[PDB]
Structure 1
């Protein structure tokens, strides 16, 4: 069971930069094995390269509360009622950094939060038909009573508002489409599947 082929079955011949900016768009040229037994010809695909991210679900297990951060995401504009989204704390992982380093730095910069214990949730590919981006989600223990106000680095043109909701209310917002970005959906569905054991572990 499971997948059929490995890295032994594909050769990346070359990569070419198509667009070089803050982010990049690359052309990968490659050949690969086929399910019918043969080899493909040389194929090309465009791939959006923007690095990889750490995501933190800030969960208060005592109060059963979740911290959300609100900020504009202009890319949401064309398909959303508003480009301001309710999200998990998140940021890019720089060379040599750990997921936890980033999650803790972003929790402070974006939400004013200290973080206690942490556990992995999931690491996922955002949209692997067109981008390499991987996001690694942690749940972090927080005191939601300390989560409030406006944060973000104005030097980065980052303007962020903290919201505190109950876990049930956050999940209701997913169901209703009020929270509709992948990282937050994945994190909050995970929390609905795991909260009983997580709260027991963190309130012993």
Structure 2
């Protein structure tokens, strides 16, 4: 048995833009139903609004390799030894675009990769206590030997080593962790489905 309430059980009174620049910081003001019946008082939350993203895990099922992109993410600085991260191909979704369209485009522009078949992995909320951001991950069939290079470096690594880097903390951004854990759970069936 899962969630109890739906959108009909929340009242969003107003949304105040506290800051607008490249992105926005909004104040949500809302009331919601309580598990023991009744309505909450008025609540406020400061939510970072940056739109939503498409993520592609480029996987070569023949070679059992993945393609990773390395670039600086300055927000990693305070809690990481280096702010250069190994990540999945990703891009923000603009109005009217699909996840698959963005995923395929960025794989070509960021890593020089033609993608064959795709499959959905998962769609997740990055940090629902402070941002609306949702990221939708696909796995994409690639020939990793064709991988080819904001300032990005393209890496080709075995699935085994990439997953080991998740275990060791060398890969530690949510999208990459989720994608590579999924691959560790599904690569046997995937390699069969895509080499059959």
Shift of residue 6, structure 1, vs aligned partner = 0.7
| CA deviation string 1:134-189 (max 9, x = no partner) | 000000000000013xxxxxxxx911000000000100000000000000000000
Aligned twin of 1:188 = 180
What CA RMSD, in Å, does the superposition of the two structures yield over aligned residues? 1.2
Shift of residue 100, structure 1, vs aligned partner = 0.7
Count of residue correspondences: 196
Q: Which runs of 4+ in 1 moved over 4 A?
A: none
Aligned twin of 1:61 = 61
* Structure 1 unaligned spans of 5+: 149-156
The normalised TM-score by structure 2 is 0.99
SS in 2 for 1:36: coil
SS in 2 for 1:189: helix
| CA deviation string 1:47-93 (max 9, x = no partner) | 00000000000000000000000000000000001000000000100
**d(CA) in 2 for partners of 1:74, 1:139:** 26
| CA deviation string 1:103-146 (max 9, x = no partner) | 01110111011100000000000000000000000000000000
| CA deviation string 1:7-49 (max 9, x = no partner) | 1110111101000010100001110001121101111111000
**d(CA) in 1 for partners of 2:72, 2:165:** 18
